[PDB]
From a paper:
The second, AcrB(ΔLoop), lacks the entire gate loop, due to substitution of residues 615–620 by a single glycine. Wild type AcrB and both gate loop variants were crystallised in a novel crystal form at pH 6.5. Crystals of AcrB belong to space group P21 with two AcrB trimers (6 molecules) per asymmetric unit. The wild type AcrB gate loop is clearly identifiable in the new P21 crystal form and adopts a similar conformation to that observed in previous asymmetric AcrB crystal structures. Both gate loop variants also show well-resolved electron densities for the substituted residues. Overall the backbone atom positions for the AcrB(AAA) variant are similar to the wild type gate loop, while the AcrB(ΔLoop) structure reveals the gate loop deletion to be remarkably well tolerated. There are no obvious structural distortions elsewhere in the structure for either gate loop variant. These structures confirm that the gate loop substitutions do not perturb the overall fold of AcrB, its trimeric state, or its functional asymmetry. Strains expressing gate loop variants were both found to be highly susceptible to erythromycin, when compared to those expressing the wild type (MICs: wild type AcrB 500μM (or 367 μg/mL), AcrB(AAA) 125μM (92 μg/mL), AcrB(ΔLoop) 62.5μM (46 μg/mL), AcrB-negative control 31.25μM (23 μg/mL)). In summary, we have presented two AcrB variants in which the gate loop is disrupted, either by reducing bulky side chains or by removing it entirely. These variants express and fold similarly to the wild type AcrB, exhibit the same oligomeric state and trimer asymmetry, but are significantly impaired in their ability to confer erythromycin tolerance.
AcrAB-TolC is the major multidrug resistance efflux pump in Escherichia coli, where AcrB is the efflux transporter residing in the inner membrane of the bacterium, playing an important role in capturing and expelling a range of structurally diverse substrates. AcrB is homotrimeric with the three monomers suggested to cycle between three conformational states known as loose/access, tight/binding, and open/extrusion during substrate export. Crystallographic studies of AcrB have revealed that large substrates e.g. erythromycin bind the proximal pocket in the access/loose monomer (access binding pocket) while smaller substrates e.g., doxorubicin and minocycline bind the distal pocket in the binding/tight monomer (deep binding pocket).The proximal and distal sites are separated by a short “gate” loop (herein defined to consist of residues 615FGFAGR620) that has been suggested to regulate the progress of substrates through the export pathway. During efflux, large substrates such as erythromycin are proposed to undergo a sequential export process, first binding the proximal pocket, then passing the gate loop to the distal pocket, and subsequently being extruded out of the cell via TolC.
Author numbering:
A (entry chain B): 2 to 1040
B (entry chain A): 101 to 249
C (entry chain A): 300 to 348
D (entry chain C): 51 to 100
E (entry chain C): 847 to 895
């Protein structure tokens, strides 16, 4: 330190090296919008064709929830059992578990229960997948000539692009949205009753005529001695066309003519399944969901995927064009563009202050060099610890800019201050000054990392979120104190110009320094004043208590978000049709939505993706907006857009449709709110529990002063269609029940029977009824079952039919039957209270009605008892470190007492912008506190130094001190508030953040320092009046 | 963990070569303990129930969430879960001209779920209005309905 | 000792949806020993102070 | 019993599309035989956890 | 003809790697040695000399 003063170039060398490690770290540093934050989730999915909710819940869901024993780090297990036949089980693991190991344990316990599954399930697929709902991008595929439908495009998609997208640099997962080409045979009921045939015959013959066969080989080992030839013997080859499948035989008549497949049914390459139907601005389309590779850059992966599709553009068939519904990337480029703009800008501002206060280009050149470095190195230590450039890490940078700006400023300043005060040539001046501020600097380093490490240790997603800031800021701060201890003092001793004793350059400058006087004068004014406010004390203590209590009141009256919602260039409007609805109605309301966005939002909406998303009953639209430069105004922004759209779809519909903007980080605890799970625990019926849910509907709706908007999160029971087979009548006529059910099945749900091979890709082969013959209950008459002796039996001969109720979507929680209940706290009330009242209400519920929390309410139920313990540790560590630095167990209080003075002004302005006590606000709070304490510390120490090593009085000393510490406090807060300014007054992309950070900070700095430069010596002087008589006064000594 | 999964991997090379009785009755792979960490007991003071009832409660309400605790190698159940238990009468079987085969095959027929289907199932017909669930052969729930088999 | 505490929370959670009269009993558990045994090494260290 | 061009467009090419997002992969190379065998070799970044 | 390319692999890949490594390696190494001398010895000159 003292060391580098005489070793400047040693300093330059370390500077250089930190810079090149930095620049290197920066050239090759990953980017995404947000760092990985959600606890690891693996969902096992499988489909059981033709099945209803309880068929998949009771044949497969449960065989897996029973074989999933002994997998490491289970947090919770939750399953949907859809009436589409699909079952999805979500396993979330303890936050920070090896994603992979977990998944493989899961995939293997699955591979062991696999023989206890049904056969259709086994062949249809059980998949184990990591469940991030965050697709880097969705590319939509269209055709200008409108040549093809969706099934065609879709197959094209499955056949040409997924290969070259999944080879693209940075592309991790590639996902297919839609149904591929599968061989679709639509049976004709009358045509089949015609010939004495059933779906049995159809399937069975189809199996015969289409497979490969255990082949064999000539000259095969062991051959005969002297053998000569050895080659491949081709057998039954799988069929290529519809044209070959028409000709496969179903039944021979007496008079010889054969009855082919072509005869009895319509035969076509068809869709694998037609639940999900998609339009991109009215033109049919299929889609791709691309996920970013692990440890990969988002923006390049975007640019590379884009160059990859653009090259393939001309080989697209007739009229096909690529379009872009979803891309997190452009917003990322622009948020990042703005953070860099900030850091640089604050630098320029610091320059303008430093000049327009110290008015010497060299002095102003030093801090200019300090930060770029600390920046780079910070970029480097985070590079080392392996973080990424995301919103959390970069804004974690912004928040620390104040610490950097200040570290450099304090030093250059004190040095100049020493020359101006004493007339030493630059070096000896810097040695003296580093001599003054050194002990403080290590101290400040210890107190700062004392408030910033505790926030790292938080738990869950929130804790992750915090760790990003905590670390970002301990690194920036660390490197900046070292730069402050190694290089900058050396930079001062070297490139700094001597300033004549008693200079101050008072006046002299006709053009300029008409200000220096103004500031000198005002500086004595200032001292005059403070002495006066130590002349009587009481007022100002009261005043303090006033400020503290206000601080608290305001604190309570603050909102609690997690992360600000940002205009992200896209949003979605989701649709729910009444229970029982059909594809066409849902589809109707969607076309109306789409056209509306394209109509009354012609100047805004760029494109709409309408997803009629199976089940039928619900529909959904993903929405695109034009680039931010063409949607300038307030009514042109997402707030207003979504408002006018929900206004539209509110009254005028027979179907409920809302339009909303997304949370930033996708898997967000909704701030004030919770995920309740109501569980059945006694061998209870679905009926009883649903009715219990009704009960808690009545009990929670009866409490609006605590709970607000309590809801089930599923689809309620709908009527279903019971077909009771008189088994007796069936065993009577001679018909096989396996044949009745399997034919019925093949008729209305369908049967996956074989594979075929089109163009060199294996694809599915299904058989179902033609549309018009399996729609309305009377179609039951149209189908026939043949006995063992050979005759036709209509179904209405041996069955009775009716309607009833049932549940289409069967939910489970940690292995047991349950019903999920979302909810949030009354407009004023907190989530914790609400959760408690929910427990008191649900406690009213029956035996075998127990309750538990998950997800959001899980994360929020355990790691929230951590806040006070962590800031206890903080209060005590910070206190202990200061107790060491000053040699007092008591003087530390004079600096710890400032903490409210900054906090108060932050919340003030923060309420005045009606923002919210969120992460950005809070890390801001610390930062604010932190500088308030640094400056408090520099002042307290300076005072003390005067008292000791010069034997000056207490009151004089405080005066002297505060005097020499006026000019810098101002420079910094001046610089800071003036650089931060744009954060507060900026819209453009993502400025919800920019504003959220900026406000509390700027307000913070204002009241912080405007209070500090009066309350600190008061704090000092009073607190200092609880110490020894003799000494007291003080002013003799002995050096 | 790694060990467990490599071993489970070679086990999948033995799995299609094992018979179906074995396959469906259960094959387990465990990185577990040598001995018992602890034994949990389940009783009833009044003796309202027998023991097998208790056992059923143990495999039905309890055993599943215990074998999922992170850090639990294996659970052993002292007892059996309730299973639908059919004890044949041999002389009764020669009586009516029947054998256990009939028993199996018939039990398979009159007790399963079946690929049901959907009214208005996609693709519907143009102008269709109905879309609802078709309830099929339901698995039998009680002893009494097994009586009628 | 931890797998122990977790099995405790799951079981204590399962208590109420049990039928008539059911009670859990403890025949075997290596744990209370581990805690109380290392605990006496503690009482030692302290009194010894 | 199957042939080569059969195994490659039914088994091999199906597998190289699922090998997306494998970390520290250097190069991928696959054989597709009519001796019934289909074989895929993934060589990884020098020093990757095996 | 058009679209028929070349590669090295295995043995020849790793050797294309050592080739591709030669220049940067004497670059970084030469520039470190510079810093270290300019640092230990307080001179800008001794490194050029
Ligand atoms: C940013 C540059 C700094 C310069 C800003 C200067 C403005 C100061 C603003 C707030 C400080 C309070 O200002 C100060 O209040 C006390 C009152 O307690 C006055 O002190 C005066 O009043 C009290 C009685 O009322 C006396 O005991 C005291 O001897 C007397 O001189 C100060 O002389 C006055 O200047």
């Amino acid at each position: 330190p003292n060391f580098f003063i005489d070793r400047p170039i040693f300093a330059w060398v370390i500077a250089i090296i930190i810079m090149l490690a930095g620049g290197l770290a920066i050239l090759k540093l990953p980017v995404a919008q947000y760092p990985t934050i959600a606890p690891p989730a693996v969902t096992i999915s499988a489909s059981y064709p033709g099945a209803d909710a309880k068929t998949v819940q009771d044949t497969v869901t449960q065989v897996i929830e029973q074989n999933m024993n002994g997998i490491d780090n289970l947090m919770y297990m939750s399953s949907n059992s859809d009436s589409t036949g699909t079952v999805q089980i979500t396993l979330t693991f303890e936050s920070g578990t090896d994603a992979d190991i977990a998944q493989v344990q899961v995939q293997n316990k699955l591979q062991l229960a696999m023989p206890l599954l049904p056969q259709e399930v086994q062949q249809q697929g059980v998949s184990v997948e990591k469940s991030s709902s965050s697709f880097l991008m969705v590319v939509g595929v269209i055709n200008t000539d409108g040549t093809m439908t969706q099934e065609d495009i879709s197959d094209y998609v499955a056949a040409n692009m997924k290969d070259a997208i999944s080879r693209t640099s940075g592309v991790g997962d590639v996902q297919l949205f839609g149904s591929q080409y599968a061989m679709r045979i639509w049976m004709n009921p009358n045509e089949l009753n015609k010939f004495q045939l059933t779906p049995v015959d159809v399937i069975t013959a189809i199996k015969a005529q289409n497979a490969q066969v255990a082949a064999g080989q000539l000259g095969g080992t062991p051959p005969v001695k002297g053998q000569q030839l050895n080659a491949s013997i081709i057998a039954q080859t799988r069929l290529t066309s519809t044209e070959e499948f028409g000709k496969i035989l179903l039944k021979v008549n007496q008079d010889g003519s054969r009855v082919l497949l072509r005869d009895v049914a319509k035969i076509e390459l068809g869709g694998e399944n037609y639940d999900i139907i998609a339009e991109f601005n009215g033109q049919p389309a299929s889609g791709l969901g691309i996920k970013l590779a692990t440890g990969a850059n988002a923006l390049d992966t975007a640019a590379a995927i884009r160059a990859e599709l653009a090259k393939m553009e001309p080989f697209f068939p007739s009229g096909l064009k690529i379009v872009y519904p979803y891309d997190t990337t452009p917003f990322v480029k622009i948020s990042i563009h703005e953070v860099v703009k900030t850091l640089v800008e604050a630098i320029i501002l610091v320059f303008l202050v430093m000049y327009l206060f110290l008015q010497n280009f060299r002095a102003t050149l030093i801090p200019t060099i300090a930060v770029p470095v600390v920046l780079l190195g910070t970029f480097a230590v985070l590079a080392a610890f392996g973080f990424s450039i995301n919103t959390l890490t970069m804004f974690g940078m912004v928040l620390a800019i104040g610490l950097l700006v200040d570290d450099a400023i304090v030093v250059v300043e004190n040095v100049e201050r020493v020359m101006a005060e004493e007339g030493l040539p630059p070096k000896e001046a810097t040695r003296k000054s580093m001599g003054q501020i050194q002990g403080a600097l290590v101290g400040i380093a210890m107190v700062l990392s004392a408030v910033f490490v505790p926030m790292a240790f938080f738990g869950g997603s929130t804790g992750a979120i915090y760790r990003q800031f905590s670390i970002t800021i301990v690194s920036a701060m660390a490197l900046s104190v070292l730069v402050a201890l190694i290089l900058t003092p050396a930079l001062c001793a070297t490139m700094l110009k001597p300033i004549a004793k008693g200079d101050h350059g008072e006046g002299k400058k006709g053009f300029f320094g008409w200000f220096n006087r103004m500031f000198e004068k005002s500086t004595h004014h200032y001292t005059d004043s403070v002495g006066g406010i130590l002349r009587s004390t009481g007022r100002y203590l009261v005043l303090y208590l006033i400020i503290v209590v206000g601080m608290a009141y305001l604190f309570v009256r603050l909102p609690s978000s997690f992360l600000p919602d940002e205009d992200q260039g896209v949003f979605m409007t989701m649709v729910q049709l009444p229970a029982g609805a059909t594809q066409e109605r849902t589809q109707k309301v969607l076309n109306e939505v789409t056209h509306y966005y394209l109509t009354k939002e012609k100047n805004n909406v760029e494109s709409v993706f309408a997803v009629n998303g199976g089940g039928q009953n619900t529909g959904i639209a993903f929405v695109s907006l034009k680039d931010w430069a063409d949607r300038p105004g307030e009514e042109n922004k997402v707030e207003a857009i979504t408002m006018r759209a929900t206004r539209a779809f509110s009254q005028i519909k027979d179907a409920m449709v809302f339009a909303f903007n997304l949370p930033a980080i996708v898997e967000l605890g909704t701030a004030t709110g919770f995920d309740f799970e109501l569980i059945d625990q006694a061998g209870l019926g679905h009926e009883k529990l649903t009715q219990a849910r009704n009960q808690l509907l009545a009990e929670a709706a009866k409490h609006p002063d605590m709970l607000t908007s309590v809801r089930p999160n599923g689809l309620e029971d709908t009527p279903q269609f019971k077909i009771d087979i008189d088994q007796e009548k069936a065993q009577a006529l001679g018909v096989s029940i396996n044949d009745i059910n399997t034919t019925l099945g093949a008729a209305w749900g369908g049967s996956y029977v074989n594979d075929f091979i089109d163009r060199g890709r294996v694809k599915k082969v299904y058989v179902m009824s033609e549309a018009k013959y399996r729609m309305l209950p009377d179609d039951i008459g149209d189908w026939y079952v043949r006995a063992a002796d050979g005759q036709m039996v209509p179904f209405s001969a041996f069955s009775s039919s009716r309607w009833e109720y049932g549940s289409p979507r069967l939910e489970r929680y940690n292995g047991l039957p349950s019903m999920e209940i979302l909810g949030q706290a009354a407009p004023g009330k907190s989530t914790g209270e609400a959760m408690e009242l929910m427990e008191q209400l649900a406690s009213k519920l029956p035996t075998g009605v127990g309750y538990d929390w998950t997800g959001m309410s899980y994360q929020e139920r355990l790691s929230g008892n951590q806040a006070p313990s962590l800031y206890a540790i903080s209060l005590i560590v910070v206190f202990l470190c200061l107790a060491a630095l000053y040699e007092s167990w008591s003087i530390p209080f004079s600096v710890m007492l400032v903490v409210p003075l900054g906090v108060i002004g932050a919340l003030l302005a923060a309420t005045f912008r009606g923002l919210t006590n969120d992460v950005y606000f809070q890390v801001g709070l610390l930062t604010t506190i932190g500088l308030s304490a640094k400056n408090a510390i520099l002042i307290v120490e300076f005072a003390k130094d005067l008292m000791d090593k010069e034997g000056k009085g207490l009151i004089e000393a405080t005066l002297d001190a505060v005097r020499m510490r006026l000019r810098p406090i101002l420079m910094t807060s001046l610089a800071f508030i003036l650089g931060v300014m744009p954060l507060v007054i900026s819209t453009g992309a993502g400025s919800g953040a920019q504003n959220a950070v900026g406000t509390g900070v700027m307000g913070g700095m204002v009241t912080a320092t405007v209070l500090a430069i009066f309350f600190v010596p008061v704090f000092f002087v009073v607190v200092r009046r609880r110490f020894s008589r003799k000494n007291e006064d003080i002013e003799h000594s002995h050096t």
